[model samples]
Target: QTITVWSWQTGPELQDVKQIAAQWAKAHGDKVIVVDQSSNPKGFQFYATAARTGKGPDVVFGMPHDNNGVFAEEGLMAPVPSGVLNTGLYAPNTIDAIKVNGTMYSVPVSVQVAAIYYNKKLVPQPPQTWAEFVKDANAHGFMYDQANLYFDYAIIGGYGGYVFKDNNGTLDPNNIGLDTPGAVQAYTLMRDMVSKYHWMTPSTNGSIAKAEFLAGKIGMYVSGPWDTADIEKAKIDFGVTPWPTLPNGKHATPFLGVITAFVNKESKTQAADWSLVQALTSAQAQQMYFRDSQQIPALLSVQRSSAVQSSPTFKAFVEQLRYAVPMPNIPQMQAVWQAMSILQNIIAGKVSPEQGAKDFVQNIQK
Candidate 1:
């Protein structure tokens, strides 16, 4: 019987999933049909629509933080098979990402994490703290992706802060955490870095900022595995370093975005689905995916394998993923991020952080 797998993977990113499907088929003697519904930029809308109607594929690939919350809340996704992830083959971080309400929701296959990428030719050592980073960047004209909220929130949360506080595993909606003192300081620091210090240029979009860094025009930026190929193509003398720390000397807690496969709760092919997920996320498959796709593996065993451990690019991302925090799996995460984006605009000098936090808190409680 054929098990349908739906993904928006395209180009090099899609190649790894296709390879996994082929390998799984070879192992189980059952074909895994891949339905490539990828849109160049955003194919999440398709996944969301299919999830709502219960017509989605048996296994779907998406970010659990944002996508899983929506599907799980709407009863569109089901728990991953018992003991499948616990087989001691997956990474610890991968396990933590799929759990919601004490049950597993998906199997993470790869981790998307951010690290500081800088031109070694210009500056040999990366900053150990945010203060040092600001001073250094101000001296050298550092730049990062201001339009991206992940890095924005990471900087704020790095100062021992949060966008939403989880009270005993329950996200507290009554009090928005972005208004906390740490957030204010974080926002002010960022705005000052750009406006007051004139150290950073506003990021336009994905790859654009990183490209500038590769061209040796921008001194430093934040990026992830998705940008690996471009960095390599440029062949610039550079290094991947840990994220800068907060004022209090805490490392920025960059959000770890997991690429996972979720089984449809309504599917009648549980056994087949389990078999496919198991094989696809196995150490061998994950290693292949990482090597071919230029992404970091979610399997600890694969991450420590000779292949990945030997590569500088893979090791850099894995280091970040080690302490990386997965985004909140709650259904309201979209609202949380939207609120944060508003705060980001404020930090970029579009509005006051106080007013932005007020609007953010209001939206959170809504």
Candidate 2:
């Protein structure tokens, strides 16, 4: 029998998964063909449409867990068989991240969250608080993707801001908190970091910030584990730590993004497809993924293994995941992204914080 799998994973990660699949195929006397659907601009739309037409891959891999809710609502994903897979072996937050309507719609394979990556040669010690970080970073500048919503949300959320409130286990879109006093204060601090403190400039973007860090011009920056390979290649002496605690004494909680594998609802070979999912998320396969791709595994057992614990780089992100907030997994989050754009504009000096926050609140309110 032949099973088809679609994924957005590219380069080394893709090759690693393919190698794992080949092993699974040889063991089971079945063939697994992995397709790179990432290049397709309409990948998600194609998956949904193809599933509706009863013609799609048996599995979809490496999709963001936040899409579980949307895909479940569209009938594009199928729940794992009751006794086929062990859900308890994975991290609780990772399991919770891929659940939709009380059903586990996908198997989380890996997690991604941002943290402070500092050049130890410059500061020697990572700052424990935002105030200390600012004082230390004032000399060479603390940089990040200032215009990106993902990075900005961490700072705002650290100061008690939230996109939507949880009401009886569901995210209530009506309970927008972007315009609250805490958010206003957070926004003010962000503005002053560039304008008043001159720590970072409006032109500071992700690539430039990374380049600056590589060149030893940046003291610290916010980034994910994916960038570590490049930083290591640059030979800059650096260390990873969770984002600094805010002036309010709360830790910055960046959005946690999980890479999940979903079984297609329209697959005719449900048993085989599900078996493939199980094999892929198994501890062995996850460890292989980590060994090759350097992405952190979602399985608790694999994460606790000496192979993972011995590396401070992976350990730093694991610690940060304790305070991380899973990205909102509802369709309404689309509006939240739009609202974030207004907040970004506020930080760029194009609008006042009050007006921007009000606009964002009003936009998401609808």
Question: What is the TM-score of each predicted model, taking all chains together?
Answer: 0.86, 0.89
Q: Taking the tens digit of each residue's C-alpha lDDT, what string does model 1 give over 1-366?
A: 778888755556567677778877887887788877655244464666776677777887645445677777777777776677763666655566677666778887887777877777777777767777876677655767764567777777776567557666556555556777777777777777667777664444445776678788776888766666667678867677778767777777788777887788877888888777777667777776777655777777677777778876676675666557677777677677555567557756778777766776777767
In model 1, which runs have C-alpha deviations exceeding 4 angstroms? 8-13, 26-45, 87-93, 135-140, 167-170, 173-175, 201-207, 313-323
lDDT of 2 at 125: 82
Q: Could you tell me how far off, in angstroms, the CA of residue 309 lies in candidate 2 after the best superposition? A: 1.8
lDDT of 2 by residue, 1-366 (tens): 789999866656677778878888988888899998867877545676677778889999878777667678888888877866476877767777787878878888888888888988888888888788878788666888876767877878888888778676677767877799888878887887788888777777788889999999988998866676678789988888788888778888788889889898878888888888878777888897777656788888888888888766687786777777788887677667656667567767888877777887887767
Every candidate's CA RMSD:
3.0, 2.7
lDDT of each: 0.70, 0.79
With candidate 2 superimposed using the best TM-score fit, by how many Å does residue 132's alpha carbon deviate from the native? 2.5
Point to the candidate with the largest lDDT. 2
Worst lDDT 10-window in candidate 1: 38-47
Residue 139 accuracy (lDDT) in model 2 = 65
